[PDB]
Assembly symmetry: C5
């Protein structure tokens, strides 16, 4: 109610307050509770192995030196006063690049409570590093984490606990990933023992299961249809060598074009993937079909009956072998 | 007219002023009237799901600590004095990267009125996230919003409203996006009850309808023409096996190439859209035409009359099926 | 010319000087002459509809409060003194991203003259926004401007004029652009009546004409060559249908490939372009050629005389129709 | 355990501490031990010949001006006090771009010991430059270094050394790169004599060996298969001129397409590489095959026995010559 | 060397020192000797027409106001002290983005000598604009200059010179450009008479000659081979019309594909280049070959002897004309 009285109280609290000293200095470690409200996951990139995360990050502790009485109201002070208070040396272990928004002001909130309780909130957009195993891509299921740790202090000086247990991290439900779909998020709290000593550690881990419909429609289906078309050559009269040659080589060319342009579109992740195995299997299949036709034409003149027998045998073997290969591929990667 | 008198008045007003105290602290919430004058909309990135906007953002309120007498003319102060007054902690809920233009000086305006009225203007460019459902793309209509909220204060301390009813936001017609076309913009003034409590909320949302002519001329028309060309093989005698084989397979190759180049040129949004269904339908059609020719060629030796009848049936079946497919597609996506 | 005396005079002038108060407060508006010396127009990006510019921008204005006497020289002070003066709130209406170079120091020059006049120069690299009309691309003629306006002051307080008349802008001739040749630059001074009174406005506009040689040699010529090659099928014995089918379909494939690759190379602005119209016209022509050949081959057995007549008439019509289409295209767009 | 007593001790330590003077200024050089704990290696781009690194950098030394007695605790101070001390002018010789993360605070640790020993830690993400000789790419083996030097001081003022011997650098094993695989890291400590004087110099070097399986699967195998397909025309009766013409020319087109697409997908370093030699060799082989068929067709009508002999000799020579070329390629570059 | 005495000396020197006043203000100009030690040149971009350069920039002058006595040893100070002295307003005329490396400390050095001599060192990376002409690309040879000039002061107040003559710039030998090869570097010390007076201007120019082997292997050789293959149709019996038509049209397709892929790979610089003329020439050659064959086929039935004569004449005319064109081209650009 009295602006001047509140100002006097705040100035008295700030007077004699040494920001260079943590609260309860020389005593038991000060516990800090952390709450994360994930506004949205911006973008996941396999090329850079990173995901952009936008969130509200709030820390909660108690500083005795800041305890004040006579004003029952919680004091949500202006952000600019935050520079005048001790704050935890919280940082994210695996953020490649992070920043705090500043429009129209720094997205920063300080709230004091009569018992000396301090609440400090930030709005952070951080690009965290998530190493991914893409052997089973695009049928992959990644597990991307965000780590939180104190920088200078140890467990003897500061301890981290999740504020609210499994309810501490909110907003997972409303996250919209156009390509992925969040399956499960977990919170872990523990201590990491470096050679220097023990440090607090908090981990927020999501598991993301990748959508597959787009890759089935746009990637696998063209290859399957090209492989099927390659078998048209079998039901062709052997005398019409020109048409069979044109069909086989054109299907091979189409397979090469789709493979290379998919590689161009798909991320440049340099190692083997399931999609690569399937595409090379289809390519080997069409190549073998053309080779079989060449063998048929070669032995066609000497033993036409054996050539016809080979052609009709391939008419069954090639679709059968392709189906068997597809069954093996789907079982292995599902 | 006396600059010394004005300087004395300003020094008196700033003397003892506490930036940490909102106007009428401990009393009624302070009303804030916000206006946005949009300069232009830069880009609408579907890949990153965000739009870039530039606007003059003005906040209007009253602070009694700044009321002065004797000077009828309003005080248009330098932008640096804004660092010494109190300003609302306005922030944007769905922004990813925003900044204030500072050339040549920071684009910040402070205007004080004799009755303590304060007007505070910025020139802000922001990249606001906007989740897009591109299933009906490119025939889709999107709805991109901009949310404005007080980061620290609650509805008990501050209240937002649009200064000027629905005339608060201007320049919508002056926006000229080459790609989209603005349909309707709405201003919403509400309250949101988070776990902490109630916050004001001002939402300015546009609905954009994507222009279609470019995709009609550049994407659908070539696919339709290739589909039509695939039907040429029907008006060919079965003897010209090489001719029909080459025609069908080259139409298939052309379809694949145009599909791949459209996929690469179009945004890499990795899920099924309308255009992809259309392209796969056309590809299925050319595949079926080639397969039909193969079947006719195989059965022509045994039952030439039956094969000729099947071909002449296909001559009309294929265009009819394609027309039905197009009708179904263009009803399902209109 | 004593260094200590000069320092004392400068301190005295800065003593009792209020930055927040404009000169001639509550009196005549302060005139501000402006000069621009353009160093180099970096790039003109059509995709982002913007252009990068680098220039020397100088503001020249009288100031009674800074008048000094007894020193004949015009003081040239460090940039770090400019923060202690009053400067006009000049900004640019349509700069997406503008900044001032700061290596090895801020490119800011302050010069004071005994009569109280002040010269203030900056070196600025600004990315201005230029909305382009590409309906006649690449034969377009853009008009890209730069607007200069006061931010918080009105014409009742500050006036902008081009100091030097039509010569106030220099270095336009030395500008070099890979794709454009500057035709004409214009300077305009006016006052724009916003809601909050009038505002001074200085517009500097350029008209840019796009070079056509690269597009002619790289886009239109190959399309014309393939169009001509389409007619080759006309001077072919129709009995050998396989060769003609291959020729027509492969010309269509080549046309599609070049069209897609030009789409990939050319900017991705999604609407109608003259180049697009030309490419679609050529594609339509080759498609019609293949269709005519198919119809001739179909009717070749009913009456060879009619087929030969149709073929020989096509040999005349298609070059004639193509020439007429080219005439229409080059006359409509020029 | 006395807060005010420790504050007094810290103020006394900072009382008269001159930052601008090195410890023991004018006396023996101050030995500085350095440790690096590498968090991760972000990426290794050959396009810019640079790799991004992130690590904790710790400097350990002694300053007599910062020695305290009576307080057994190691004073772990706030980061903001680091600006009031002296720290070595350590810098990296080849950092194109580097920064210190500031979320949630600048990751800067200051720790003081009773004996005046100071430990100073930073979390640095940098972009080191690493020139690469990719002639043997993708079978290359890069040597990428990070060099550390004093910017202003000489060996007479400061002497860098590795703290704790070769164990000064940790986290090498935890580094994971999708494409490479660390073989060995080395630490070098020395002095470098310039014209001005001798500078201490530290060097941390990595030897990265590139993974080869991805390119075997993606690039070499398609080319080998295309070469084998080109060989097919040898086992084709020379009467089928159209068949062999189509086969050879289509194989050439396929080789061109894969060559161009692989050149685009691969990094754009503009000089010769082993993979380029391999692709040009395959192109040479397919060109020779088509030329051989052309010669056989030309001489076929005159001396058919000679033409058949040439074809059957090509049947053996071409696979043999290709095997020899592959042997040369996989012996020289391995 | 006494710490307290040195600190007293430094404080005395800074006592009353005015940064805004240049040394010998109002008197003779102060000569500045500048050395540049180039560490590396990152990249040269034709798309942006600029080169990235990292260097040590050392200025050398004398300010008697800072002259000290009694300390024979030279002094080296923390970079922060540079904020309290006078330094020249040096800048680079043709830069686009420049920054002083600031890890760990700002890469800045200040050294003082008893005679008042000041040495000032920066570690600067800048992207300098170099207007590159690429008519003769890739056989071109560029001349890229970095200009250095004062901003506010003129030749009356300050003069620029190279400290070390032609040895002022070092490290040019160590520069490693994979794309280019440094041929010569020159230093000039001109004066420029702008409308505001005469300014010093130190120019450092490089001449870079582009390495060409990569383009010969990857760009010219495929075109030559395709042109050669286009002549295969000449050694084909005219009866086999299908084979020759397919060969010609497919060679045209391959030429178009390689030209388009080169366009995509080559920098988007939109004006005619030597490589474009060469590719257009090759394309015209294969187009004329196909046209000649078509004319031969048309005239074959009426005058078979003339057709045979034309076919046998082309086998020499086309290779001879192509060799003549190649001679003209490779003599024009070499
Ligand atoms: C992505 O992948 C990471 C791993 O790389 C997953 O993170 C792991 O999650 C599991 C749980 O799912 C964690 O396991 C937990 O470890 C805690 C710490 O254990 C240490 O300390 C204790 C003493 O305090 C020692 O005894 C122990 O040996 C370790 O040194 C435990 O306290 C937890 O116990 C809880 O669960 C068990 C049952 O599993 C119960 O019996 C307990 O009562 C208690 O409830 C638990 O064991 C593991 O530590 C995490 N890894 C790391 C490195 O911390 C992510 O979960 C995954 N992402 C997703 C979305 O799942
Ligand atoms: C893009 O998509 C967004 C949603 O994602 C759309 O935003 C919605 O816009 C509509 C209006 O078009 C909003 O509806 C309005 O909400 C107001 C606020 O309601 C709250 O407060 C009132 C009290 O003030 C409470 O009674 C109520 O329970 C809420 O707590 C209402 O005041 C508005 O009332 C109007 O309509 C009613 C009838 O429905 C009339 O009786 C009233 O007189 C009045 O005319 C209205 O209901 C909606 O809230 C917005 N969504 C969200 C999440 O807030 C955008 O409109 C869309 N883009 C475009 C271009 O349409
Ligand atoms: C790119 O496109 C822009 C427009 O989008 C062009 O800018 C226009 O340029 C023309 C000149 O070529 C400008 O026309 C001039 O406007 C001046 C301002 O008029 C206003 O203000 C005055 C008071 O100051 C009012 O009286 C008046 O009603 C307006 O409100 C006039 O003063 C000029 O008049 C002079 O020339 C005319 C003949 O043209 C004479 O009759 C007059 O006596 C006088 O000498 C003139 O009319 C126009 O205003 C500009 N646009 C804008 C928005 O300002 C660029 O030129 C174009 N780029 C290129 C390269 O051409
Ligand atoms: C990537 O490439 C870099 C080079 O570009 C490699 O770095 C080199 O590593 C070697 C070691 O493997 C370094 O060699 C060492 O140099 C030290 C400095 O030499 C000076 O001082 C000595 C006296 O101490 C003088 O004799 C000498 O003339 C110099 O003035 C030496 O001190 C080292 O000596 C060690 O080995 C010798 C035997 O060879 C022993 O007798 C010594 O006791 C001692 O153990 C050693 O010679 C070399 O200097 C590094 N290069 C540079 C430029 O410094 C990287 O190793 C490479 N990457 C990988 C992964 O290997
Ligand atoms: C890239 O291209 C630029 C030009 O665009 C080249 O820069 C030129 O470099 C040459 C030197 O290589 C410069 O020529 C020299 O200029 C000096 C300054 O001239 C001014 O000052 C003198 C008085 O001091 C006046 O007389 C004169 O009018 C000018 O006002 C001269 O002092 C030099 O003279 C010396 O050499 C000449 C022969 O060249 C002798 O005859 C003289 O006796 C004397 O020894 C000389 O003329 C030229 O000015 C530069 N041009 C520009 C625009 O800066 C770059 O060199 C080129 N890149 C590379 C790698 O070469
Ligand atoms: C100081 O400023 C005055 C005022 O601009 C300069 O006087 C001008 O001098 C030029 C020639 O150099 C004349 O063409 C102008 O007409 C003069 N203007 C006026 C108002 O007198 C003077 O030259 C400047 N001197 C210095 C050393 O900068
Ligand atoms: C302005 O007010 C000051 C302070 O009262 C006074 O000293 C001065 O004379 C006044 N000047 C004018 C022009 O009114
Ligand atoms: C010039 O200034 C110096 C320093 O203040 C002073 O000692 C000297 O007397 C002055 N001389 C004149 C002529 O003003
Ligand atoms: C703690 O420090 C305060 C302030 O210096 C002092 O008054 C008090 O006596 C000290 N107490 C002890 C036990 O050192």
């Amino acid at each position: 109610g009295n602006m001047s009285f509140v100002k006097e109280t705040v100035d008295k609290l700030l007077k004699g307050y040494d920001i260079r000293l943590r609260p309860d200095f020389g005593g038991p470690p000060v516990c800090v509770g952390m709450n994360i409200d994930i506004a949205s996951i911006d973008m996941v990139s396999e090329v850079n192995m990173d995901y952009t995360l936008t969130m509200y990050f709030q820390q909660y502790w108690r500083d005795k030196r800041l305890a004040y009485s006579g004003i029952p109201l919680n004091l949500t002070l202006d952000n600019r006063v935050a520079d005048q208070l001790w704050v935890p040396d919280t940082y994210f272990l695996n953020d490649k690049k992070s920043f705090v928004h500043g429009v129209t002001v720094k997205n920063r909130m300080i709230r004091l409570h009569p018992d000396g309780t301090v609440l400090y909130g930030l709005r952070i957009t951080t690009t965290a590093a998530c190493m991914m195993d893409l052997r089973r891509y695009p049928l992959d299921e990644q597990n991307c984490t965000l780590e939180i740790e104190s920088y200078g202090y140890t467990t003897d000086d500061i301890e981290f606990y999740w504020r609210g247990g499994d309810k501490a991290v909110t907003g997972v439900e409303r996250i919209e990933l156009p390509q992925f779909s969040i399956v499960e998020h977990r919170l872990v709290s523990r201590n990491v023992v470096f050679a220097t000593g023990a440090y607090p550690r908090l981990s927020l881990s999501f598991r993301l299961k990748r959508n597959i419909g787009y890759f089935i429609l746009q990637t696998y289906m063209p290859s399957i249809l090209i492989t099927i078309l390659s078998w048209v050559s079998f039901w062709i009269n052997y005398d019409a060598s020109a048409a069979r040659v044109a069909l086989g080589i054109t299907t091979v060319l189409t397979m090469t074009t789709i493979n290379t342009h998919l590689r161009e579109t798909l991320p440049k992740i340099p190692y083997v993937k399931a999609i690569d195995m399937y595409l090379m299997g289809c390519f080997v299949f069409v190549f073998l079909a053309l080779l079989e036709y060449a063998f048929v034409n070669y032995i066609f003149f000497s033993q036409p009956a054996r050539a016809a027998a080979i052609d009709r045998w391939s008419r069954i073997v090639f679709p059968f072998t392709f189906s068997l290969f597809n069954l093996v591929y789907w079982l292995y990667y599902v």
